[PDB]
Paper text:
Each head domain (hd) can be subdivided into a “RecA”-like lobe that contains the ATP-binding pocket and a “helical” lobe that merges into the coiled coils; they connect the heads to a half-doughnut-shaped “hinge” dimerization domain. Smc2hd and Smc4hd are furthermore connected by their binding to opposite ends of the Brn1Cnd2/NCAPH kleisin subunit (Onn et al., 2007).
In contrast, even the wild-type (WT) version of Ct Smc2hd-Brn1N was unable to bind ATP. The [name] head fails to bind ATP on its own, presumably because of the deformation of the [name] P loop observed in two different crystal forms, but readily binds and hydrolyses ATP when in complex with the Smc4 head. This transition is presumably the consequence of a pronounced reorientation of the [name] helical lobe and coiled coil by ∼25° upon head dimerization, which is transmitted via D-loop and adjacent helices to create a P loop conformation that is compatible with nucleotide binding.
Residue numbers in the entry: 1 to 212, 989 to 1179
């Protein structure tokens, strides 16, 4: 799936039906000086996707999202996303028969909302299942990168960064075999405790009494031989489980080691493309192990720096962005949104982001919402927004356009 069309009707600053068509399969930028008109395009997208962790499309009464809150001749709102669905390997399950898929979300007076799929009424859960089947995880969005995530990554502790790498390793789905092994061992341990309980409370006291008639001694003495032979065989069965667990802990540590090397390699190459001549790596802090966590180390130019605090604002954004993007491959999504990440960035830096997208993220659709104007001017498709007449208007352009 990839966005081909977005229609915004009676929603926030978009008073009149606005058909925004021509979305590029790889790289779109939303630009211009109309801050509200730009941001409302992202709002409209997140509103249809059902994003619940974005304050700008959240309200006690969603009538607030209708243009002028329903008081200026528009009493309903509608947003539609149209997706191309020709690539059947990336189709939502259960919708493969559609060459295109449209999802519409409506607001009426009072704030109740409804959904349509391909123009027909649809349950909210049907819409959410569709998006989740193509890895647009509305529950915990992987595909939306805001300034807050950049700041959060910049402030993570070594333990928190290693958590990301552990999380990316994909070995908690490995863990299922480990905890099945653990309780087949706990059952083995249980038998050992009841073997020693029998000896302690029953066999050994009786043998000591019988030894201080003569046929009863050897009857109990054989039972002490029985459970001893049993205790031995249980210990060795339990040991085979201990080896099984030892091998899964080994697979765990190798998978993480491999993930660390993959992320660290991509992270440093990405940062070198966003800040040419520079480099970065993920390393344990100093004289510490890998499971005490990983910290970001930066080489500005050819010189390694002791702390991230020594980087400019723009360099800091680029290093966090490079790590975020190096990790996308482990929770991949068919579209990615970079929302207003350019506050501290030069124009050359944002041009570098565009070439990174075009060369390294083929097969995904990027949508970049520019904070400043004049950035991301090499995007394959440019949507330029400005203010007029109590309604936003959108120009659809390319870098090759004369106007």
């Amino acid at each position: 799936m990839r966005v081909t069309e977005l229609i915004i009707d009676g929603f926030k600053s978009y008073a009149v039906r606005t058909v925004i068509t021509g979305w590029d399969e790889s790289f779109n930028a939303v630009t211009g000086l109309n801050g509200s008109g730009k941001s409302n395009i992202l709002d409209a997208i997140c509103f249809v996707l059902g994003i619940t962790n974005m304050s700008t499309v959240r309200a006690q009464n969603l009538q607030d999202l209708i243009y002028k809150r329903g008081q200026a001749g528009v009493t309903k709102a509608s947003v539609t996303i149209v997706f191309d669905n020709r690539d059947k390997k990336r189709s939502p399950i259960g919708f493969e028969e559609y060459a295109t898929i449209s999802v519409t979300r409506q607001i009426v007076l009072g704030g109740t909302t409804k959904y349509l799929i391909n123009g027909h009424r649809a349950q909210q859960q049907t819409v959410q299942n569709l998006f989740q089947s193509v890895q647009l995880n509305i529950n915990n969005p992987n595909f939306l990168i805001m300034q807050g995530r950049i700041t959060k990554v910049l402030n993570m502790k070594p333990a928190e960064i290693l958590a990301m790498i552990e999380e990316a390793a994909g070995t908690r789905m490995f863990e299922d075999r480990k905890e099945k092994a653990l309780k087949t061992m706990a059952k083995k341990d249980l038998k050992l405790q009841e073997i020693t309980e029998l000896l302690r409370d029953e066999i050994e006291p009786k043998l000591e009494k019988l030894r201080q008639s003569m046929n009863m001694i050897d009857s109990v003495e054989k039972k002490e031989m029985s459970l001893k032979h049993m205790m031995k065989t249980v210990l060795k069965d339990k040991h085979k489980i201990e080896e099984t667990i030892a091998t899964l802990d080994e697979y765990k540590r190798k998978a993480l080691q491999e993930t660390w090397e993959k992320v660290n390699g991509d992270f440093g190459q990405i940062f070198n493309e966003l800040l040419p001549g520079s480099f970065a790596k993920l390393e344990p802090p100093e004289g510490k192990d890998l499971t005490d966590g990983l910290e970001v180390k930066v080489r500005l130019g050819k010189v390694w720096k002791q702390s991230l605090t020594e980087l400019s604002g723009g360099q800091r954004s680029l290093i966090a962005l490079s790590l975020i993007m190096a990790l996308l491959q482990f929770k991949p999504a068919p579209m990615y949104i970079l929302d207003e990440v350019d506050a501290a960035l030069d124009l050359s830096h944002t041009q570098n982001i565009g070439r990174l997208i075009k060369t390294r993220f083929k097969g995904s659709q990027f949508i970049v919402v520019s904070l400043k104007d004049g950035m991301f001017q090499n995007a394959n498709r440019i949507f330029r927004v400005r203010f007029s007449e109590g309604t936003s208007v959108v120009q659809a352009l390319t870098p090759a356009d004369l106007k």
